[PDB]
Amino acid sequence: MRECISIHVGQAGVQIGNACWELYCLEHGIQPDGQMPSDKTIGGGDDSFNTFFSETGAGKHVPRAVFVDLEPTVIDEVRTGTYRQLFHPEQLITGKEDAANNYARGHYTIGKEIIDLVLDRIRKLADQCTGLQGFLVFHSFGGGTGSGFTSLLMERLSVDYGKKSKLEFSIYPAPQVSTAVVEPYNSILTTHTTLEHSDCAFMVDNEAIYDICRRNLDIERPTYTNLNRLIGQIVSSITASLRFDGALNVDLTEFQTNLVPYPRIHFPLATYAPVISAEKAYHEQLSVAEITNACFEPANQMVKCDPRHGKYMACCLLYRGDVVPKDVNAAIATIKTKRTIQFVDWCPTGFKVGINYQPPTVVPGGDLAKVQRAVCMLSNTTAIAEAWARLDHKFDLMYAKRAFVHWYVGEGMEEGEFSEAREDMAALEKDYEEVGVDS
Amino acid sequence: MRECISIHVGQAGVQIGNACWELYCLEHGIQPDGQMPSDKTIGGGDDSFNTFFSETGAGKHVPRAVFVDLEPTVIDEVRTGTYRQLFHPEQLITGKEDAANNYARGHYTIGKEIIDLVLDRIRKLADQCTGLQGFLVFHSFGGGTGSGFTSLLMERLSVDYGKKSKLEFSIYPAPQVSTAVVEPYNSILTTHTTLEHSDCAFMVDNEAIYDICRRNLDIERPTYTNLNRLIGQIVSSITASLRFDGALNVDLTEFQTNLVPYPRIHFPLATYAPVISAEKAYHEQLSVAEITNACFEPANQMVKCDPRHGKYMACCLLYRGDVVPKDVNAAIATIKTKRTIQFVDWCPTGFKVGINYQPPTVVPGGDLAKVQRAVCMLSNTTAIAEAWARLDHKFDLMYAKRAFVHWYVGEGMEEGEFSEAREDMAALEKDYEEVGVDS
Amino acid sequence: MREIVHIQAGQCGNQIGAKFWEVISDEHGIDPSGNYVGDSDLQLERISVYYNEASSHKYVPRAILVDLEPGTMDSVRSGAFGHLFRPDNFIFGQSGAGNNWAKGHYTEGAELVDSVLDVVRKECENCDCLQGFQLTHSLGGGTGSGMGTLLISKVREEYPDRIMNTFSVVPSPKVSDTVVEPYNATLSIHQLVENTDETYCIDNEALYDICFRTLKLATPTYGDLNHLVSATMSGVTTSLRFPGQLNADLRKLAVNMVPFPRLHFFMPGFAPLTARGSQQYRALTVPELTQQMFDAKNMMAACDPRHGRYLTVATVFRGRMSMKEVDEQMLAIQSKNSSYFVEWIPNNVKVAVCDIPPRGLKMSSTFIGNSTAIQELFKRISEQFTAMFRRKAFLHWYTGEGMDEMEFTEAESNMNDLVSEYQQYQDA
Amino acid sequence: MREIVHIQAGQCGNQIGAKFWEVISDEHGIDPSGNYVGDSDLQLERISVYYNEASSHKYVPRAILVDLEPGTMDSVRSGAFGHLFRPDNFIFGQSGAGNNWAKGHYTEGAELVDSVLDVVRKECENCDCLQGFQLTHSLGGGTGSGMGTLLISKVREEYPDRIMNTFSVVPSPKVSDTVVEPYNATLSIHQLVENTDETYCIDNEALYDICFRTLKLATPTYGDLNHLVSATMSGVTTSLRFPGQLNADLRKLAVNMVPFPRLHFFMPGFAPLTARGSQQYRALTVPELTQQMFDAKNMMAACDPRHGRYLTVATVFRGRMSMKEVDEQMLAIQSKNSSYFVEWIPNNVKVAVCDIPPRGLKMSSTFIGNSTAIQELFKRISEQFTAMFRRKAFLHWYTGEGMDEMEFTEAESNMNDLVSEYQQYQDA
Numbered sequence A, B: 001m002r003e004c005i006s007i008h009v010g011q012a013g014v015q016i017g018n019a020c021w022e023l024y025c026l027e028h029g030i031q032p033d034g035q036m037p038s039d040k041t042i043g044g045g046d047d048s049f050n051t052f053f054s055e056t057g058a059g060k061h062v063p064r065a066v067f068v069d070l071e072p073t074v075i076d077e078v079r080t081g082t083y084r085q086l087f088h089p090e091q092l093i094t095g096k097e098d099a100a101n102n103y104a105r106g107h108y109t110i111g112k113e114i115i116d117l118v119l120d121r122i123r124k125l126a127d128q129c130t131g132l133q134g135f136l137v138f139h140s141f142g143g144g145t146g147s148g149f150t151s152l153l154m155e156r157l158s159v160d161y162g163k164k165s166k167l168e169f170s171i172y173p174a175p176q177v178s179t180a181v182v183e184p185y186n187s188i189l190t191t192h193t194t195l196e197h198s199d200c201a202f203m204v205d206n207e208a209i210y211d212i213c214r215r216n217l218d219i220e221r222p223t224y225t226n227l228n229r230l231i232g233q234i235v236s237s238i239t240a241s242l243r244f245d246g247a248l249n250v251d252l253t254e255f256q257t258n259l260v261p262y263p264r265i266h267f268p269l270a271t272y273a274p275v276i277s278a279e280k281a282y283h284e285q286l287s288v289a290e291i292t293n294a295c296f297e298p299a300n301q302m303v304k305c306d307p308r309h310g311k312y313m314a315c316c317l318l319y320r321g322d323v324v325p326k327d328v329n330a331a332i333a334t335i336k337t338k339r340t341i342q343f344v345d346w347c348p349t350g351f352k353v354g355i356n357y358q359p360p361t362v363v364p365g366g367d368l369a370k371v372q373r374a375v376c377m378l379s380n381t382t383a384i385a386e387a388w389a390r391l392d393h394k395f396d397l398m399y400a401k402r403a404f405v406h407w408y409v410g411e412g413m414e415e416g417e418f419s420e421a422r423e424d425m426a427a428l429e430k431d432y433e434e435v436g437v438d439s
Numbered sequence C, D: 001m002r003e004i005v006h007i008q009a010g011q012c013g014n015q016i017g018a019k020f021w022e023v024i025s026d027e028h029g030i031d032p033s034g035n036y037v038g039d040s041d042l043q044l045e046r047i048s049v050y051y052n053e054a055s056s057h058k059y060v061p062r063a064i065l066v067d068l069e070p071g072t073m074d075s076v077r078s079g080a081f082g083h084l085f086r087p088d089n090f091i092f093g094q095s096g097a098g099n100n101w102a103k104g105h106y107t108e109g110a111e112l113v114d115s116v117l118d119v120v121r122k123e124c125e126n127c128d129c130l131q132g133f134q135l136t137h138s139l140g141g142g143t144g145s146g147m148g149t150l151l152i153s154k155v156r157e158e159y160p161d162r163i164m165n166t167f168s169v170v171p172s173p174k175v176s177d178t179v180v181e182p183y184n185a186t187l188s189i190h191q192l193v194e195n196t197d198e199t200y201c202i203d204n205e206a207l208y209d210i211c212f213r214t215l216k217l218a219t220p221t222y223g224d225l226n227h228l229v230s231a232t233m234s235g236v237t238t239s240l241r242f243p244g245q246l247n248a249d250l251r252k253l254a255v256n257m258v259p260f261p262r263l264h265f266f267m268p269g270f271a272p273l274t275a276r277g278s279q280q281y282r283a284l285t286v287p288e289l290t291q292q293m294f295d296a297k298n299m300m301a302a303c304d305p306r307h308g309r310y311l312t313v314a315t316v317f318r319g320r321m322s323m324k325e326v327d328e329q330m331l332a333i334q335s336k337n338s339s340y341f342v343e344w345i346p347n348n349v350k351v352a353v354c355d356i357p358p359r360g361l362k363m364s365s366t367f368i369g370n371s372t373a374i375q376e377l378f379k380r381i382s383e384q385f386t387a388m389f390r391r392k393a394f395l396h397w398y399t400g401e402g403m404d405e406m407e408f409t410e411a412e413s414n415m416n417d418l419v420s421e422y423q424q425y426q427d428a
């Protein structure tokens, strides 16, 4: 009944999707081959896996995910890995040539040639489901495929259905760490399509996750694989209420109405706590109040921006495990008393509480320790504007000299859109500060 | 040849009737099921039970009483308890919805639904009645059914017969003790039937009986059952002359001959003595002079008013037991010599003496102690006017703010009806004061 | 004879209503399967008020469960005393309200209101003489506050001569788990003040305080809070189910409670409530119960009655007790606290006595008070509503469902008038 | 030769009349069954005056019982000497008068007067030569005072030549058992003075005083009072039933008693009266009996003879005494009490001697006296009537029966005229 469709585009999207789907299968008990063992044997799984997977024949489950990318090398790993049997061959869509870090290549040069096959696959999955809660898209702003193909695909989805939520998980370019020379161009060009179509976009920065894994998890050198393992936990916790029972449940259609006060302000952040190792777990006593304090700590946040500079507008609190409502009420009361955390004047109540019975599941071989409680924080703040300000400054310096602009122009871009993107991006920052102005 | 019919309306009337008929069967030696052991209970039978019990078939005695109530909860207990077989099932008439402490509901909305049925039962009993002396009605002023249905019932009886004296037994609201918020409204509206239709109204107060039981009967926490038993003794002594034999007998007609100086003055009060426990019976002598003095004291009165403030107009004394006429004459002289007691100048002789032979009967498991003498006092005094003043003050304050008026209006009442009843109450009080003025 | 139709709306109503039927079944001695296993004839004498007799000595409740989500119904069905309810009484939606009043009343409720109107209509002809309807819903939610309010209007038009009861909770001042609580609460008071005869206010914050100090419980539970609400529900209608020396049904209590049609908001209360340790030290007397009833700590609402004058007070006694004792206790309370009661009404106390005591208790009493301090609860909701309406926060979500800005203003104006009338007579 | 018809009306008349027949039966030696068990011939010589011969050797009195209630007849029939009366003579009503004079004269008295007139007419023709009628009733009641007055007027018209005797009691000054006594007494007096040849006034208070000081009894009873009245009745008509040296019938006494038609009120008395412990020290001589006659405490009326003057005195002696003694003591009393006797009447003493003594006594006598002191009794009644008639108290009951207010005024005026006539004779 409650069903969702996840779409992964780009090398980053597939890599994160591979880690996320591994977590999803283990939470339900599905083996990598796709057969449900006698431990679960489709017992009480009306919504446990129907929301993510689908039942085909007997002793076989297929996920409702579409893997589309412009290069076959990343898709080859999935088709060669252990989870090849679990996925359907037609769902995994490959390509001939990548976007080569060019927004136009994934939009005009190559995007429309292969987008026809992607649309049919989504339609086939949609007909199988009865009630579609929404869509999930994973991509990266810096990548050309994650900025060009995603922009074109998202527009077509709104044309077809135009009535279902489309949550977006994107990786924002780091203020200092970079591996490309056209990141400001790609990042700016995709801001308009995210604001126009996506109802809620969660932004993460690789630098922040690196520090969390280095310090909190005590890792000398974090890797990309370890980063993806953390990312799956927020996504699993976000959709935990849809698949598992609990005292207070929040559905996918309640995130938007309780987070965005205006259609333009739809860029919240994410925070996960507690994140500790097994050794630290024995010497630390986890409590409801302790985890809540960690979530509000700027150090533990997943965004390089400092929340204390800005103000909080809307906050969400999702609890998993043995969590009682009484402890949460006392914990949130102390947060409001603290002077350091500032709330918007016109928002008297900005706390949403959700409790799930299912405790977090620890994947074997992961650095995460077994903890009976976990809190997922989805807060909308005006401090996110600083991150946008950094990338905007870099774009102005590059656009002034018009370096590498001819690369975009050759594939079909025009200088007018670049100026329009800056105007649209500047309006978003101005509107963010305008709403933050007090009475 | 001489018989009477008793009517009980409302919750209060049913409970009093249950206690009254319990003593009536015991006095005449009638079993609760209905068979009278005439082999051992040797009696005349001409007027011992024919006045109240009508023989049917062989060895069956059914009371000449009608039980009417708008709620079946109270009556169902009578139809279920020990005395179920005593009463004819058609004599117990039940409704579906109560008056909900609304005079209009019991007089304008629900009373008209079952008024035809109750009149038919009275007519059927009247056909079997060779000669009927009058009707006795039991109800309460505070209740809506006790004030609404009773007022509608007496208006039909007056039109139907118009030549039989009707006696009223009502419970006057207490000054400081109350169980409802709309009691003053019901009391004022029910004065019309008690002034024009009823030929004699007997008023008792719950508060006064509570004090009597605490001090005389040494009962710390008396209940409703104890209160009803004392009221039942008053009715039994009044009708004892018509049921038994004595040197001097006073009937219902003779009661109004000497106790009604004016047609609009028919509100006397009742006093019973002696009431003592078994412990004090052995340490005291119950002489004729002693019991007569206790009746005139204000502490033994069944009403909370003060008789010393007012003046006596007409007095009636009923004697039961081994009472000799010589002792009564001497006792009366001593009463007339005390200067505390005052009498009206226009009435030189205001004493009526009735001596019976049957001693009082004690119900097993009760509170009263066995005695050889008993005096029932019925005196019409001007001190009753003080009782009207207390109820009038409450009505004026409530009607000033128009509190709870809309409930009565919506059921068929008018705002002008309340004002009309206020004038009648003031006129009745004025008439009482005028007669007491010395010439 | 007299029967009552029960309606459950929203997640809060379903959970509270489920616990309410457990207390009623225990009082009437009905096993979860549906067979009578009692040991008294009084239990079955007035069992038709809440249970409908069926074949093979089976009884089904006259209750209807209404929600826009199937999750709540599945838990209730699989929970204790779940199979007792009739399967045809399960009417549920598939989309949900999402804590939105507009969706429940306009967008989503209209599709399902017709279906639930069939079930409630069908029970009436089977009913011999219906007395009224009691509905449980949460004002802070979207389903119960939104769609449940619409059901009140539909029943009122069909039956304009029957009393309407709503045992509903209200948003707490400090406790708040939703962002749009003032928006939903304000839009529900407008309809409740017109199509309801008596309303009972329940505060979660007040319930927690009772379970913390009065009961000395270590950890509270939502079931524990629902147990207190169900206990109050049983004590209100104990006269209609069991005999007593002085009986008073809902209509009898209603007329003595509301002096004016608009002033129909009451605060409930239950006594006694003691911890396990203090059970062996306290006594069971009428004065002991009276003191707890007239205590601010025992009130089920966040409002403190000491800041206003009591207009009318309703008290129903359960068990065997002398009438003289109960008569003096309420008179003494009014006499001592003269400044705490209204002046232009001489007596503000209604006394009801029920012979049958509650299970595991010799004596008990339920306190109902129409105090003038309830306007403070509406005052704090108005401040939150004005602050968010000034910035037009979250208004587009409500507007997208077909609502208008002027409709929000009308609800605010009506709420301001409600607190003016309560203050006018209190300060008169 | 001469026959007397007895009529009993009211509760008081029936009880007094029942005791009167028992004394007569004892004197004539008649057992309760009705046969003769005497041991003398003079007992049956004049038995026709009171008893009617029946089949075998049974005798039945010429007594008619009239009442508006059946209770009195049941007690008389079931009592001693109750089955000796004729069953057909029992006439009783069913509604009663309710101590109201107007009920027994205009409203309900007319519905039974025809029935009782048939019986008395049937008894009248049986007597060879009837002499008169005697009636027992009470002026303070409703039945005897009202119905008895109507019977006197009706009987007088049929036989305007026969003597009328009324043994009627009057309300006492201090002892009173009814509130409306003054109204009844005044109304009945208006007719007695114009239709009755002679009346005998008996006061209940005076009877109690006699049994308290003269008889020295501890607990007086209504039977004791009735015995004194019955003894007087036998003494009055002892000459008709038994022979004597100087006999005087009812007509002979009446001629010597009343000097004027309107002055026919007498006070009765009997001698001797001694206690049970004073029998030894008491001498049964003519001087002793004569002294007791002219004594204040021996009178059966509350009026004091010394206050006024004796108009005419008639005494009847029973037994065997010398005529020389009885002709001297009365002369000595008249000379010694010359201040208490009228001047224009030379001799004020009438002497009658009978031979047959009573039962158990060697000598006995009765005293009958006409004095002006009886005006005091009517003076108090007039004062009571004016006080109650001033405010029209207890008048709607009398008015509703059909009478008029002006009727009360006429009765009061006539009674005031009666005492005025007594005033002029004594003062002059």
Ligand SMILES: C/C(=C\c1csc(C)n1)[C@@H]1C[C@@H]2O[C@]2(C)CCC[C@H](C)[C@H](O)[C@@H](C)C(=O)C(C)(C)[C@@H](O)CC(=O)O1
Residues within 6 Å of the ligand: C217, C223, C224, C225, C227, C228, C231, C272, C273, C274, C275, C276, C278, C279, C282, C283, C360, C361
């Ligand atoms: C019997 C009694 C009190 C009492 C007896 S003599 C005296 C003085 N006071 C009450 C039970 C009562 O039924 C309610 C309303 C109890 C209502 C249920 C309460 C609110 C809790 O949910 C419940 C689980 C409890 O915490 C417990 C500890 C079991 C309580 O009910 C304890 C307990 O027995 O409390």
Ligand SMILES: C/C(=C\c1csc(C)n1)[C@@H]1C[C@@H]2O[C@]2(C)CCC[C@H](C)[C@H](O)[C@@H](C)C(=O)C(C)(C)[C@@H](O)CC(=O)O1
Residues within 6 Å of the ligand: D215, D217, D223, D224, D225, D227, D228, D231, D270, D272, D273, D274, D275, D276, D279, D282, D283, D284, D360, D361
């Ligand atoms: C016989 C006699 C007196 C007497 C004889 S020689 C003498 C001198 N005096 C009288 C009866 C007397 O005939 C009457 C008048 C009869 C009068 C009856 C008297 C007055 C009482 O009422 C009566 C009932 C009594 O109490 C009794 C017990 C009969 C007696 O005490 C009354 C009592 O003294 O008896």
Ligand SMILES: Nc1nc2c(ncn2[C@@H]2O[C@H](COP(=O)(O)OP(=O)(O)OP(=O)(O)O)[C@@H](O)[C@H]2O)c(=O)[nH]1
Residues within 6 Å of the ligand: A009, A010, A011, A012, A015, A016, A070, A098, A099, A100, A101, A102, A140, A142, A143, A144, A145, A146, A147, A171, A179, A206, A224, A225, A227, A228
């Ligand atoms: N979290 C996470 N991010 C990754 C991973 N691999 C690549 N990325 C992100 O992806 C960026 C590299 O470019 P891609 O997003 O892969 O480019 P693309 O979407 O394939 O588009 P093209 O380069 O034009 O083919 C880096 O800046 C990373 O931020 C990964 O394994 N985990």
Ligand SMILES: Nc1nc2c(ncn2[C@@H]2O[C@H](COP(=O)(O)OP(=O)(O)OP(=O)(O)O)[C@@H](O)[C@H]2O)c(=O)[nH]1
Residues within 6 Å of the ligand: B009, B010, B011, B012, B015, B016, B098, B099, B100, B101, B102, B106, B139, B140, B141, B142, B143, B144, B145, B146, B147, B171, B178, B179, B206, B224, B225, B227, B228, C245
């Ligand atoms: N003495 C005595 N009084 C009673 C008893 N029962 C009820 N009452 C009186 O009745 C009042 C309660 O109202 P009711 O008289 O019963 O009202 P009702 O006659 O049933 O009419 P409704 O209230 O409209 O149904 C109380 O205030 C009591 O004074 C009783 O058993 N004994």
Ligand SMILES: Nc1nc2c(ncn2[C@@H]2O[C@H](COP(=O)(O)OP(=O)(O)O)[C@@H](O)[C@H]2O)c(=O)[nH]1
Residues within 6 Å of the ligand: C009, C010, C011, C012, C015, C016, C097, C099, C138, C140, C141, C142, C143, C144, C145, C146, C169, C176, C177, C178, C204, C222, C223, C225, C226
């Ligand atoms: N007393 C009580 N309150 C509850 C319960 N469940 C939820 N609530 C309260 O109800 C509010 C949410 O209402 P909700 O259930 O979402 O209303 P709905 O959307 O109409 O179903 C929260 O603030 C809770 O405090 C319960 O079982 N008992």
Ligand SMILES: Nc1nc2c(ncn2[C@@H]2O[C@H](COP(=O)(O)OP(=O)(O)O)[C@@H](O)[C@H]2O)c(=O)[nH]1
Residues within 6 Å of the ligand: D009, D010, D011, D012, D015, D016, D097, D098, D099, D100, D138, D140, D141, D142, D143, D144, D145, D176, D177, D178, D204, D222, D223, D225, D226
């Ligand atoms: N001496 C005497 N007086 C009686 C007797 N019975 C009644 N009385 C008097 O009669 C008065 C009452 O008269 P009542 O019987 O009512 O007259 P009724 O209405 O004609 O029956 C009382 O005051 C008594 O004093 C009796 O047996 N003896």
Ligand SMILES: [Mg+2]
Residues within 6 Å of the ligand: A010, A011, A071, A098, A099, A143, A145
């Ligand atoms: Mg690539």
Ligand SMILES: [Mg+2]
Residues within 6 Å of the ligand: B010, B011, B071, B098, B143, B145
């Ligand atoms: Mg009632």
Ligand SMILES: [Mg+2]
Residues within 6 Å of the ligand: C011, C012, C141
């Ligand atoms: Mg909810």
Ligand SMILES: [Mg+2]
Residues within 6 Å of the ligand: D011, D012, D141
């Ligand atoms: Mg009499």
